[PDB]
JSON list of C-alpha atoms in Angstrom, two decimals:
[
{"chain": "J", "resi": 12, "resn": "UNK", "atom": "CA", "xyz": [15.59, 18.15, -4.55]},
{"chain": "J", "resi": 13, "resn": "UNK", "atom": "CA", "xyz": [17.30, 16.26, -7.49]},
{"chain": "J", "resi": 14, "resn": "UNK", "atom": "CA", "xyz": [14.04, 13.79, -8.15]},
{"chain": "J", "resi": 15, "resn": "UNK", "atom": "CA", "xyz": [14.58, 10.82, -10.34]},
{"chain": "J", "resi": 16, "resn": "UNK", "atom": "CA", "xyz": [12.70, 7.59, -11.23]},
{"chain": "J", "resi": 17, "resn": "UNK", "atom": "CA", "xyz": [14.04, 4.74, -12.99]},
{"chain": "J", "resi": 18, "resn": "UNK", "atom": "CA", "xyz": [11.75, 1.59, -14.48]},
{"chain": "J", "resi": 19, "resn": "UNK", "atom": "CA", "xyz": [12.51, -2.06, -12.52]},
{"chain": "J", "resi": 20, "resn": "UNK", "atom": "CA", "xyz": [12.31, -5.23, -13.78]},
{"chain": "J", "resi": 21, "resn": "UNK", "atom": "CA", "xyz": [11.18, -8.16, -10.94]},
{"chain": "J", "resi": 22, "resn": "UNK", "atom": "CA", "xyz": [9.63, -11.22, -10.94]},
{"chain": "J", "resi": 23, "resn": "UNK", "atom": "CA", "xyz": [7.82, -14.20, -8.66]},
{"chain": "J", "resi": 24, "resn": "UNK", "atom": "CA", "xyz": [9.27, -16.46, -10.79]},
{"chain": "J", "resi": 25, "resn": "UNK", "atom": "CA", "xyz": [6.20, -16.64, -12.53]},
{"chain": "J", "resi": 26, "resn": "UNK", "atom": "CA", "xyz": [4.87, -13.55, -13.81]},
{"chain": "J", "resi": 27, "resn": "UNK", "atom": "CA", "xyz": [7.36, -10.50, -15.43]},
{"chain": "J", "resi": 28, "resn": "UNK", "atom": "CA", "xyz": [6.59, -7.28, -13.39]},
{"chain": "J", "resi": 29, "resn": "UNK", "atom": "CA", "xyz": [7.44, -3.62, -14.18]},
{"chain": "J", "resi": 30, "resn": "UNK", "atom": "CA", "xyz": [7.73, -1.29, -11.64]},
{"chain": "J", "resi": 31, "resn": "UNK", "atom": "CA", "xyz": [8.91, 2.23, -10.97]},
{"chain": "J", "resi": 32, "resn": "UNK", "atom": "CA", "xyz": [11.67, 3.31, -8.71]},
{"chain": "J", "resi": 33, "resn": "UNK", "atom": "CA", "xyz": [11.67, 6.99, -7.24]},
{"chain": "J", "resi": 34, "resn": "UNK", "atom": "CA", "xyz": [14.42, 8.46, -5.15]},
{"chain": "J", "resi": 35, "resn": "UNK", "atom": "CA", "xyz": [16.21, 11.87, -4.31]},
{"chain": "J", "resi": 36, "resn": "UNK", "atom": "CA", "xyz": [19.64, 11.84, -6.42]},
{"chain": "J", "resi": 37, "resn": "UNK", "atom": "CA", "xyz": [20.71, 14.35, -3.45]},
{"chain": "J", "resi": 38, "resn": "UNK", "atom": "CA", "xyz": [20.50, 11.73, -0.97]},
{"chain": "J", "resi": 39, "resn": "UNK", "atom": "CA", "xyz": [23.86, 10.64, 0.95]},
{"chain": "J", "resi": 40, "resn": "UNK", "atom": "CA", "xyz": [24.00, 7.41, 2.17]},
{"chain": "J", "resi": 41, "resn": "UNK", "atom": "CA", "xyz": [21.10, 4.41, 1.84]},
{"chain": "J", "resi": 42, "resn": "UNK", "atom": "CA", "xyz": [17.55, 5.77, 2.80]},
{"chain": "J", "resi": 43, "resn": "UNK", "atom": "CA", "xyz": [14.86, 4.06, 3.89]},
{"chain": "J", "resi": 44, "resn": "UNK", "atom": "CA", "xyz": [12.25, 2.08, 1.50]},
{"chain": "J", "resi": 45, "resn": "UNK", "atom": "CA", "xyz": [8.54, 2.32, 0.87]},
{"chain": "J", "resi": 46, "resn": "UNK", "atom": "CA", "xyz": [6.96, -0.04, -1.12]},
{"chain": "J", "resi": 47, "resn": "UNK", "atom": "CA", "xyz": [3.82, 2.08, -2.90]},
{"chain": "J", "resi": 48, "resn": "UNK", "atom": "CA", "xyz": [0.96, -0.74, -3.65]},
{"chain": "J", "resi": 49, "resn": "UNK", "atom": "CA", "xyz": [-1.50, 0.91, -6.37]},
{"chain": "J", "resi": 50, "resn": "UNK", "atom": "CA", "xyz": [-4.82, 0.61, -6.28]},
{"chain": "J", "resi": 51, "resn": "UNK", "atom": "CA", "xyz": [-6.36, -2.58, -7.95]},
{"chain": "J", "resi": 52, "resn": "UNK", "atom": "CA", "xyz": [-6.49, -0.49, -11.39]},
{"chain": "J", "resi": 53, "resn": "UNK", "atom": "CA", "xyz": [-2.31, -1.50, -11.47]},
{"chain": "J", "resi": 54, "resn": "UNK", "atom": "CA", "xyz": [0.57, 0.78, -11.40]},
{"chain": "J", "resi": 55, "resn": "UNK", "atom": "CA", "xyz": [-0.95, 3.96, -12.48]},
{"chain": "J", "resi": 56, "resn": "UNK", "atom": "CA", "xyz": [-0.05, 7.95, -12.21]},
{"chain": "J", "resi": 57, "resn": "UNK", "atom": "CA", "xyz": [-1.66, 8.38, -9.40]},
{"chain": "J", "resi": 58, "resn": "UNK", "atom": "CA", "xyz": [0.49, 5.81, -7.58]},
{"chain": "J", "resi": 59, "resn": "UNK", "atom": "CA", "xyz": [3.73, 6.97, -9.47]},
{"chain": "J", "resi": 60, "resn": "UNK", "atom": "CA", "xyz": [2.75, 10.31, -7.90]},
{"chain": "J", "resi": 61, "resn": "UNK", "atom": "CA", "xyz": [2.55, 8.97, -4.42]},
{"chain": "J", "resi": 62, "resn": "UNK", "atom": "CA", "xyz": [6.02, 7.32, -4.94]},
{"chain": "J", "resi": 63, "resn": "UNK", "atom": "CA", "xyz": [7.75, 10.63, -6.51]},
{"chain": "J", "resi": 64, "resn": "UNK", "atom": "CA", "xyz": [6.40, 12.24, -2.80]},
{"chain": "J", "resi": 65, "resn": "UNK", "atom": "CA", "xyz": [8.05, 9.83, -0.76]},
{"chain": "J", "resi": 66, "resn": "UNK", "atom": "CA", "xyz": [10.94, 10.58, -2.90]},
{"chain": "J", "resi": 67, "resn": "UNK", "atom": "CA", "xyz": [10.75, 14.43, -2.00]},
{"chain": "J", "resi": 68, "resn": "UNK", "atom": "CA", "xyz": [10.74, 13.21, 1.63]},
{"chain": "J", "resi": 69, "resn": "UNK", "atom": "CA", "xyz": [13.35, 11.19, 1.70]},
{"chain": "J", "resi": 70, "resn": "UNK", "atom": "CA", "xyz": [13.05, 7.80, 1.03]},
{"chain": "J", "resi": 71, "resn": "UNK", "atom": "CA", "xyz": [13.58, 5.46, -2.04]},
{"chain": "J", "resi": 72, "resn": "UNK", "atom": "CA", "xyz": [9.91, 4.06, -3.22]},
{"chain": "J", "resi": 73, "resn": "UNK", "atom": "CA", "xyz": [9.26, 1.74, -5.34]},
{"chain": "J", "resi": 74, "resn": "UNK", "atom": "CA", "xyz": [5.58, 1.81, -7.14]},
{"chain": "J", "resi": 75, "resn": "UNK", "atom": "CA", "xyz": [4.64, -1.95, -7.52]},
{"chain": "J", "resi": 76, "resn": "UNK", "atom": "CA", "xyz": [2.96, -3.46, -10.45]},
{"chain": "J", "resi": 77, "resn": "UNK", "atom": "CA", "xyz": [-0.24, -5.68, -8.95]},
{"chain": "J", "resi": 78, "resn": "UNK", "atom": "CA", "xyz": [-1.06, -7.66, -12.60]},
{"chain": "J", "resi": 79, "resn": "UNK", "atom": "CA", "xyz": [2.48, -8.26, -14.19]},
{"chain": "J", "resi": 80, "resn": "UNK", "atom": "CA", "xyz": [4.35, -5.90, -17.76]},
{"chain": "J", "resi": 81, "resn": "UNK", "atom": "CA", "xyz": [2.79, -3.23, -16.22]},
{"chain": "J", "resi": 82, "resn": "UNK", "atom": "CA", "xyz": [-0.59, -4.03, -17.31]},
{"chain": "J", "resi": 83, "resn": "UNK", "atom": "CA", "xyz": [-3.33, -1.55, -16.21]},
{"chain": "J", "resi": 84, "resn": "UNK", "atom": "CA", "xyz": [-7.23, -2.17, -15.60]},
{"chain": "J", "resi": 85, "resn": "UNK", "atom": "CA", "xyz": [-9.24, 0.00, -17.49]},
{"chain": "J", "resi": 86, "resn": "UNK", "atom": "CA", "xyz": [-12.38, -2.19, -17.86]},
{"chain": "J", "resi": 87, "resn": "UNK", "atom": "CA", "xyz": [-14.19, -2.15, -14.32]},
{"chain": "J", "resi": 88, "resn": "UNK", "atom": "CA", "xyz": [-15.60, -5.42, -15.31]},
{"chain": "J", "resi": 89, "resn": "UNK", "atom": "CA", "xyz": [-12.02, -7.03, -14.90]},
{"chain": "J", "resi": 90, "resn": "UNK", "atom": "CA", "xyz": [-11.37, -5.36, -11.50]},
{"chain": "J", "resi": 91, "resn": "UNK", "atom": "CA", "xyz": [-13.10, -7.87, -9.02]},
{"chain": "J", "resi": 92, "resn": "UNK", "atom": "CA", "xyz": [-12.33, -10.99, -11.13]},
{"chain": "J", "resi": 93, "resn": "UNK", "atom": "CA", "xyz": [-8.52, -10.14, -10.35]},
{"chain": "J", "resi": 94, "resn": "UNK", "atom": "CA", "xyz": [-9.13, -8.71, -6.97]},
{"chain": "J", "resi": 95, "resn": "UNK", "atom": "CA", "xyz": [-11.35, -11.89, -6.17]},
{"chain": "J", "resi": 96, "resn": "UNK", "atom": "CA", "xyz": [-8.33, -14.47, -7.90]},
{"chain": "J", "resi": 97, "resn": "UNK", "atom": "CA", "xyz": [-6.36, -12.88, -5.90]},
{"chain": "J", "resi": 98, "resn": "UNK", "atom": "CA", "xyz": [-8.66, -13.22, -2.66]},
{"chain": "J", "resi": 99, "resn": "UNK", "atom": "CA", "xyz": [-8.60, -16.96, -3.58]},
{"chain": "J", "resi": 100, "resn": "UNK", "atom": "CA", "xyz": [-4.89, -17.36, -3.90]},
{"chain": "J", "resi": 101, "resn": "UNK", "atom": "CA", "xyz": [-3.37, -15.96, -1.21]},
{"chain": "J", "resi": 102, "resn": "UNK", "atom": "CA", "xyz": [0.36, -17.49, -1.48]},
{"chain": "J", "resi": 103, "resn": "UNK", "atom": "CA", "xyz": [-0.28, -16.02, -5.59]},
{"chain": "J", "resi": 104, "resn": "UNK", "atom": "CA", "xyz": [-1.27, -12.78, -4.02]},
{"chain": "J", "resi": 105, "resn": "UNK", "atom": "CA", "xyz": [1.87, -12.83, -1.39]},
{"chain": "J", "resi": 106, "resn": "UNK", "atom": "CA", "xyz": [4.28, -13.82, -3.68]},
{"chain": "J", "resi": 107, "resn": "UNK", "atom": "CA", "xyz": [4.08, -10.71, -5.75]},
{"chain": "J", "resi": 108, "resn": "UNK", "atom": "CA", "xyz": [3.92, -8.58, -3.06]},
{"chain": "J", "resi": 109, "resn": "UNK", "atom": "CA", "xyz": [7.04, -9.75, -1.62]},
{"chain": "J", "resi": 110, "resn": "UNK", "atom": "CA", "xyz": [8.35, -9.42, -4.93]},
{"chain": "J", "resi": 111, "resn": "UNK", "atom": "CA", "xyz": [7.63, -5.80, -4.73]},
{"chain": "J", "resi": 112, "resn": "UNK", "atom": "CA", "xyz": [9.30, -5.53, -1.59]},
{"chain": "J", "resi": 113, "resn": "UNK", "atom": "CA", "xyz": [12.47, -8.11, -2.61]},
{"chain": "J", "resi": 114, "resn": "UNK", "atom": "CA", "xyz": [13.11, -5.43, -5.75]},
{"chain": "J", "resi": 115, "resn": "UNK", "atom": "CA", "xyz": [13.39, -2.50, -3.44]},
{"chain": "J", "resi": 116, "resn": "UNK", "atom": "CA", "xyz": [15.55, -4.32, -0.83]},
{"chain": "J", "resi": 117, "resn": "UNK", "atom": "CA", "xyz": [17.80, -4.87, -3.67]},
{"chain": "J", "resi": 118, "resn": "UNK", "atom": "CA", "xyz": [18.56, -1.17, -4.93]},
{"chain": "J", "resi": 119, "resn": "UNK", "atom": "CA", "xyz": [21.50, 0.26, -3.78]},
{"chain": "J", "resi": 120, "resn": "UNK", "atom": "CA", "xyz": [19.59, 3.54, -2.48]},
{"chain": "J", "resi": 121, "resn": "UNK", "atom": "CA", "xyz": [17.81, 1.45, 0.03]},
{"chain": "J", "resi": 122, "resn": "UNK", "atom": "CA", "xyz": [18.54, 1.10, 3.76]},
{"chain": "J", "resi": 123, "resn": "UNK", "atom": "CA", "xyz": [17.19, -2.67, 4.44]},
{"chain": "J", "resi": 124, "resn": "UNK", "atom": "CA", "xyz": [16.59, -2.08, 7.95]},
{"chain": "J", "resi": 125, "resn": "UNK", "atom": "CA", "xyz": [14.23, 0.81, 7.37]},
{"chain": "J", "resi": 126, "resn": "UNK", "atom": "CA", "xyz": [11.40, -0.90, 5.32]},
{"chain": "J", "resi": 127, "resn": "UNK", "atom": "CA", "xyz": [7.61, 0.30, 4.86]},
{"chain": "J", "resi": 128, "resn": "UNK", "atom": "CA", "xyz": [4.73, -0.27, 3.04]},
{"chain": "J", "resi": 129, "resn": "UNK", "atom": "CA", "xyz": [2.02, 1.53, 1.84]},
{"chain": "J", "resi": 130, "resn": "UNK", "atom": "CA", "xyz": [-1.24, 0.66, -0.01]},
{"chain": "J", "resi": 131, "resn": "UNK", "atom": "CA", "xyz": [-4.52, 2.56, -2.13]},
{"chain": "J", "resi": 132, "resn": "UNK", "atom": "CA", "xyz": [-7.20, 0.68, -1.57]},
{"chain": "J", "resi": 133, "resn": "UNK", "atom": "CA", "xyz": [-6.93, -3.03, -3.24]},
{"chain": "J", "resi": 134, "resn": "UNK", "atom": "CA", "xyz": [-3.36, -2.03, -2.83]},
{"chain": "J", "resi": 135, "resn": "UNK", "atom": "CA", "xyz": [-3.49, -1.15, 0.91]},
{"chain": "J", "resi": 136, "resn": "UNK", "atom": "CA", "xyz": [-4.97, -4.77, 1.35]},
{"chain": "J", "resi": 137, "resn": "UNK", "atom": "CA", "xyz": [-2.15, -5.82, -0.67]},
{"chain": "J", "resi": 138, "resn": "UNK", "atom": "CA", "xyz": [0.36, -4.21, 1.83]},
{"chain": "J", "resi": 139, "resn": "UNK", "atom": "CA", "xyz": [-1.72, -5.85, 4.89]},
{"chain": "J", "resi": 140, "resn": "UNK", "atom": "CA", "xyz": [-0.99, -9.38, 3.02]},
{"chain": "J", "resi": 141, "resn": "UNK", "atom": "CA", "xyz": [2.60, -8.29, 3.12]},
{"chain": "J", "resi": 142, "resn": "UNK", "atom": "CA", "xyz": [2.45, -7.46, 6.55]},
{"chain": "J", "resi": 143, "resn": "UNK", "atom": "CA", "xyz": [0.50, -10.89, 7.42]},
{"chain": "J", "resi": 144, "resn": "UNK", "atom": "CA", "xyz": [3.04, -13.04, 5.39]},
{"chain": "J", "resi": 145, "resn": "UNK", "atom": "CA", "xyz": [5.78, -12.23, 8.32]},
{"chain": "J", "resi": 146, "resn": "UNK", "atom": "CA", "xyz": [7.94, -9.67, 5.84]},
{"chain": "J", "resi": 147, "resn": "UNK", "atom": "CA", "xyz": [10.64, -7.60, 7.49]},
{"chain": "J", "resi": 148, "resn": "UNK", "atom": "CA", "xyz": [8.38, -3.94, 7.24]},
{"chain": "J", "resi": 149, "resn": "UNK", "atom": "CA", "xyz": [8.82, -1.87, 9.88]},
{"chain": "J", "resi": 150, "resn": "UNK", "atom": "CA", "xyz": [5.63, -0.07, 9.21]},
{"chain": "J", "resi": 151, "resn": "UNK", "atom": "CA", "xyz": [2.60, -0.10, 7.34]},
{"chain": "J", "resi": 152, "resn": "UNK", "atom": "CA", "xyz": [0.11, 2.42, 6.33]},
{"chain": "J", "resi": 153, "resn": "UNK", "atom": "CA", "xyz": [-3.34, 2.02, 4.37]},
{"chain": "J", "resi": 154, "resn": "UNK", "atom": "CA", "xyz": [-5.56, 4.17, 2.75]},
{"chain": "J", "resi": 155, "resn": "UNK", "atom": "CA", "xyz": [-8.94, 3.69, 1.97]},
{"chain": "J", "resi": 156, "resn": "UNK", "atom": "CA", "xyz": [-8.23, -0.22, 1.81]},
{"chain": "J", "resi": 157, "resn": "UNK", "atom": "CA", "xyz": [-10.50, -2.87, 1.76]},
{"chain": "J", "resi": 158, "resn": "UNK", "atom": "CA", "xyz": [-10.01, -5.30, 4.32]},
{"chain": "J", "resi": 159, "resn": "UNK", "atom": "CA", "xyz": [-10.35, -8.90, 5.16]},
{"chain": "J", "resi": 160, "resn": "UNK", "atom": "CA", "xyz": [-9.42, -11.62, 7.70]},
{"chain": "J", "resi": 161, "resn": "UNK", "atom": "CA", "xyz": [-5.89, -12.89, 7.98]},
{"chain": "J", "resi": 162, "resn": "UNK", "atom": "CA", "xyz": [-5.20, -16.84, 7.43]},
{"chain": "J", "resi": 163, "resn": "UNK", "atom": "CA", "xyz": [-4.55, -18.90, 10.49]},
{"chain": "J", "resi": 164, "resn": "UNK", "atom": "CA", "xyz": [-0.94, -19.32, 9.88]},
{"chain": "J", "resi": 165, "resn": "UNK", "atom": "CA", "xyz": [-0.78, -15.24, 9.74]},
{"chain": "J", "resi": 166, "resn": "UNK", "atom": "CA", "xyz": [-1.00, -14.94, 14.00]},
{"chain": "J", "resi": 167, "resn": "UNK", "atom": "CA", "xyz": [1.80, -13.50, 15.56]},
{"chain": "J", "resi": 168, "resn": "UNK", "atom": "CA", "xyz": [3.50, -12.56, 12.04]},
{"chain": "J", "resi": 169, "resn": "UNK", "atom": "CA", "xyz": [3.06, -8.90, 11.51]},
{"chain": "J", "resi": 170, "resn": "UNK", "atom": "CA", "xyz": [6.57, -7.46, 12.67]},
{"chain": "J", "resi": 171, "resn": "UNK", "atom": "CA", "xyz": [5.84, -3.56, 11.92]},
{"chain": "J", "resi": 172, "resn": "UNK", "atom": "CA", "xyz": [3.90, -0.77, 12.87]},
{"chain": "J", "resi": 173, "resn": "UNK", "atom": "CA", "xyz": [0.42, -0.81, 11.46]},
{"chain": "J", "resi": 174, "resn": "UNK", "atom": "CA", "xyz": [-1.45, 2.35, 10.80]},
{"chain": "J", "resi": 175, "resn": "UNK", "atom": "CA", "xyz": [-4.97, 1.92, 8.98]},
{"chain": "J", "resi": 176, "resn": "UNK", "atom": "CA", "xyz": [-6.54, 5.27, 7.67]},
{"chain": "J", "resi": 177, "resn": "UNK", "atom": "CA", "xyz": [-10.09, 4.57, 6.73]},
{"chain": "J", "resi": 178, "resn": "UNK", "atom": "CA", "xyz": [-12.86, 6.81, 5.45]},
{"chain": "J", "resi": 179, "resn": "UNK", "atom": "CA", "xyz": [-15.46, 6.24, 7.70]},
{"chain": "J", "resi": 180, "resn": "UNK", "atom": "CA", "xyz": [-18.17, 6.86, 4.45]},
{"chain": "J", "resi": 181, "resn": "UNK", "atom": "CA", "xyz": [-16.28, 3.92, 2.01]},
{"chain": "J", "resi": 182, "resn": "UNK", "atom": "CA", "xyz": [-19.57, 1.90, 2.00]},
{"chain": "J", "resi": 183, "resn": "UNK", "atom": "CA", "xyz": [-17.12, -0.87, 0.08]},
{"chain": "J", "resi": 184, "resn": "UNK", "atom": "CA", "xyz": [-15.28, -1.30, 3.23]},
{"chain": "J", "resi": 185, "resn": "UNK", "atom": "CA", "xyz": [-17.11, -4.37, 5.25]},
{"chain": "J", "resi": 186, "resn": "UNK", "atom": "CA", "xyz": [-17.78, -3.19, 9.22]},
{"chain": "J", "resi": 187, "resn": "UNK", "atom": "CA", "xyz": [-17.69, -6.83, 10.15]},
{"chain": "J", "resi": 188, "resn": "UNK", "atom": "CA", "xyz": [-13.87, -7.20, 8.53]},
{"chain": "J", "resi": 189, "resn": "UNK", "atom": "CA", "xyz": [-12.86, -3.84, 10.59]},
{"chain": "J", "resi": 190, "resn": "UNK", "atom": "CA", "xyz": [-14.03, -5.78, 13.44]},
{"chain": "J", "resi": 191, "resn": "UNK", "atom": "CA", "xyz": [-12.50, -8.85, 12.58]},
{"chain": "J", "resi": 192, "resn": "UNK", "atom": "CA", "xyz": [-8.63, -7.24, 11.86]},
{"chain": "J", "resi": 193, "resn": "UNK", "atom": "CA", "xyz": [-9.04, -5.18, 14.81]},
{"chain": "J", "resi": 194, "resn": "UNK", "atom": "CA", "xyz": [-9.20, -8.49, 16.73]},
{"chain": "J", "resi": 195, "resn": "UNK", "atom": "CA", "xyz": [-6.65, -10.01, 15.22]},
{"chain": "J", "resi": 196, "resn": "UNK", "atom": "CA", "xyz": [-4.03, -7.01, 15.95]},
{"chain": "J", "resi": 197, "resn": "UNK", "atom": "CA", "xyz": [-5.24, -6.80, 19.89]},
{"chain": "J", "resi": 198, "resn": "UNK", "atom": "CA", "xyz": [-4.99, -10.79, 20.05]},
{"chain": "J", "resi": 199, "resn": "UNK", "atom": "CA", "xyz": [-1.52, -10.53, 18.64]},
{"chain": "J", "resi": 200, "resn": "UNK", "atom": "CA", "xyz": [0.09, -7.39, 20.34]},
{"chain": "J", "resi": 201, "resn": "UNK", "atom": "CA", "xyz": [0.26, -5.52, 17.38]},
{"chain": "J", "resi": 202, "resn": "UNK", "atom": "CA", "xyz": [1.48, -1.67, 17.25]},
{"chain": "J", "resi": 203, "resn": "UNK", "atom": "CA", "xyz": [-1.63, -1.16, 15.97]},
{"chain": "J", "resi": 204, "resn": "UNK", "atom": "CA", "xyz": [-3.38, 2.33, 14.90]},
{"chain": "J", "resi": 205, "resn": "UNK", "atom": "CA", "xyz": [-6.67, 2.77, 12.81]},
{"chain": "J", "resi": 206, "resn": "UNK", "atom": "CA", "xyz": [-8.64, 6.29, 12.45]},
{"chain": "J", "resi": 207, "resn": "UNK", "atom": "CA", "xyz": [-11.84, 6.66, 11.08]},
{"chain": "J", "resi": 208, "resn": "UNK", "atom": "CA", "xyz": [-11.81, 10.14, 8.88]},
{"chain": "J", "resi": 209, "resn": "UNK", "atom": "CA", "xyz": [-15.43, 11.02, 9.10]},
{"chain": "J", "resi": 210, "resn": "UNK", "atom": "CA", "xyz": [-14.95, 13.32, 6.01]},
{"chain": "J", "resi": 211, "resn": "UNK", "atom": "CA", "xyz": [-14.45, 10.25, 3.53]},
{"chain": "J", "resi": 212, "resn": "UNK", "atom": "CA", "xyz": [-15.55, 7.50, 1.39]},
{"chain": "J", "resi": 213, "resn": "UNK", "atom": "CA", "xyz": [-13.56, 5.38, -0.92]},
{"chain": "J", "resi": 214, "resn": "UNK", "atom": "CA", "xyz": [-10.69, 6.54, -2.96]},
{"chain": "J", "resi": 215, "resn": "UNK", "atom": "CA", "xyz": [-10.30, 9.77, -0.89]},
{"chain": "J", "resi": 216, "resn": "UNK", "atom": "CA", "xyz": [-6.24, 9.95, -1.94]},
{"chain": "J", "resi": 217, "resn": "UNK", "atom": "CA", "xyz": [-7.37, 10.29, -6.07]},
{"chain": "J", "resi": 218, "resn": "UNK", "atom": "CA", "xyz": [-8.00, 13.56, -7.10]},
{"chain": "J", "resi": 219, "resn": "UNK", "atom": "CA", "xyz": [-9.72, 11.53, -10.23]},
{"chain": "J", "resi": 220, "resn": "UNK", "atom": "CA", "xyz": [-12.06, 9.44, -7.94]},
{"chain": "J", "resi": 221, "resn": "UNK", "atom": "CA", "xyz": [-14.63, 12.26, -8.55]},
{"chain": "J", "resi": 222, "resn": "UNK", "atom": "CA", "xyz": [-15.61, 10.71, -11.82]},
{"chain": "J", "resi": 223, "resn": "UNK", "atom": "CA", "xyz": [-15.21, 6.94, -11.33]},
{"chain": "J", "resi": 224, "resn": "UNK", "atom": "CA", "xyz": [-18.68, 5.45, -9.90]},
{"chain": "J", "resi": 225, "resn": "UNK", "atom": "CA", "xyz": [-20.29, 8.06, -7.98]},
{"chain": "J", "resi": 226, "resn": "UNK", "atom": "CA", "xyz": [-21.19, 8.48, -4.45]},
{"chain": "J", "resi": 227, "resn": "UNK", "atom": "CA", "xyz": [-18.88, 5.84, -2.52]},
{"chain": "J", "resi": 228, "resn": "UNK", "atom": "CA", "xyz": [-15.93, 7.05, -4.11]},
{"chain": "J", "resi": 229, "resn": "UNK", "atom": "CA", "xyz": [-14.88, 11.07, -3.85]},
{"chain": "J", "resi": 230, "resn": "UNK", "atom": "CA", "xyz": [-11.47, 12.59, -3.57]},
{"chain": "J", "resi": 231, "resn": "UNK", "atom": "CA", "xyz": [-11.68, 14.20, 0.13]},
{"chain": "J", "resi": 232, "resn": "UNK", "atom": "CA", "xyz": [-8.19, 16.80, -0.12]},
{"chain": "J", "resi": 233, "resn": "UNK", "atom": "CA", "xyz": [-8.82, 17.50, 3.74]},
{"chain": "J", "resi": 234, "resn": "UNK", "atom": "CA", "xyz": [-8.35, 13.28, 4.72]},
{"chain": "J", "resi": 235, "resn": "UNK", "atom": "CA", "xyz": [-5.67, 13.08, 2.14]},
{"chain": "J", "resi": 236, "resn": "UNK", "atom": "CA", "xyz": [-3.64, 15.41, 3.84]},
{"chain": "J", "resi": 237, "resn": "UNK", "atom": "CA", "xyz": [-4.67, 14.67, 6.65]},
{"chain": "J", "resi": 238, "resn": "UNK", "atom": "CA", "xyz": [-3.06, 10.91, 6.49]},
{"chain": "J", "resi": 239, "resn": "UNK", "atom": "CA", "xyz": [-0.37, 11.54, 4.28]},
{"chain": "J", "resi": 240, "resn": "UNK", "atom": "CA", "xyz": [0.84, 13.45, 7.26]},
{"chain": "J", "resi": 241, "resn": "UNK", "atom": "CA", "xyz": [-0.49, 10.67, 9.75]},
{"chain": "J", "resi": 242, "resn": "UNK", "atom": "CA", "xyz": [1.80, 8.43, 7.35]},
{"chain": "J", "resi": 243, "resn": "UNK", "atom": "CA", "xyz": [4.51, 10.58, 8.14]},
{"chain": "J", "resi": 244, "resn": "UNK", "atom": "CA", "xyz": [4.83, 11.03, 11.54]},
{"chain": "J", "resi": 245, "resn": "UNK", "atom": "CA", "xyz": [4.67, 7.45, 11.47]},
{"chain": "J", "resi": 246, "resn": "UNK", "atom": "CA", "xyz": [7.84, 7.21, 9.46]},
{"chain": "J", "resi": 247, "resn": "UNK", "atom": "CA", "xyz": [9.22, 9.72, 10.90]},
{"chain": "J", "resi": 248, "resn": "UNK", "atom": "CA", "xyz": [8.59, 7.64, 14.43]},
{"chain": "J", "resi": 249, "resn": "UNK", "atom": "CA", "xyz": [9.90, 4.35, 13.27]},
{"chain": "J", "resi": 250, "resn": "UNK", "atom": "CA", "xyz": [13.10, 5.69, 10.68]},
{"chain": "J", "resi": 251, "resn": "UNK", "atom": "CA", "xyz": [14.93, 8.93, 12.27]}
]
């Protein structure tokens, strides 16, 4: 195709946030959008990678930034103080997740009635908060994400497809919360889907996991493909 990206600006109205826009120049008319939620690490290549596929499929996707300027983890001791602030501020971690999704409504390549969201780990939680906070997503896809229960307020409010791919070796993926979000989407109706990829542990998507902190976390290229095209005939389901 004719592949392009383009850096985007956005804010809460708190924090700056630089993101990265990838679409197909070749496409006609608006397309639908996929907001790409990193990993907890931040917007990094692996997630611009993820975004530039979706591009190659179709769709406009815009790779979020999770920390604001585009700042990047690199020291593991940081990860879980952010991932845990953002645990503890859930309207904090919301806002700039609907901030992610406000900036891709707002590009002219975007169809707003054909909205997903996708999340790596941290960042598949991330897309689940999205989800939770009553956003207009038609679908949403995880992979390898940690999980954890929804706030009261949350019942009734996820509007889109859900579609949870899990490795079912992550040991930093808590069986109790599995049981606990599974409840939630059967109490509440939800077009709910979640497969347990006995191949995998955490970080199965990153090539690059394989160095990272050992067994737990291992690039699995079978489960990656496996749903990336489980992702897919999602889309495909809820956008042709």
């Amino acid at each position: 195709g004719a592949m392009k990206h383009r850096e985007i600006r956005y804010t809460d109205g708190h924090t700056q946030f630089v993101g990265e826009l990838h679409w197909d120049e070749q496409q006609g008319g608006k397309c639908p959008g996929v907001v790409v939620f990193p990993e907890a690490f931040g917007l990094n290549d692996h997630a611009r990678e993820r975004a530039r596929r979706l591009a190659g499929l179709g769709y406009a996707a815009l790779a979020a930034d999770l920390h604001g300027d585009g700042r990047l983890i690199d020291d593991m001791e940081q990860l879980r103080p952010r991932m845990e602030g953002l645990f503890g501020d859930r309207a904090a971690w919301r806002a700039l997740a609907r901030a992610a999704l406000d900036t891709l409504v707002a590009q002219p390549e975007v169809d707003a009635d054909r909205l997903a969201a996708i999340g790596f780990c941290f960042g598949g939680t991330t897309a689940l908060e999205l989800a939770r906070s009553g956003a207009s997503l038609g679908a949403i896809v995880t992979f390898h994400a940690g999980l954890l229960p929804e706030l009261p307020e949350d019942a009734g409010r996820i509007r889109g497809r859900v579609l949870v791919c899990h490795g079912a070796e992550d040991p930093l993926v808590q069986k109790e919360a599995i049981d606990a979000v599974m409840g939630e989407w059967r109490r509440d109706r939800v077009d709910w889907q979640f497969t347990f990829y006995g191949n995998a542990a955490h970080s199965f998507t990153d090539p690059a996991a394989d160095a990272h902190g050992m067994a737990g976390l291992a690039y699995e290229p079978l489960t990656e493909a496996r749903s990336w095209t489980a992702m897919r005939n999602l889309f495909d389901e809820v956008f042709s």
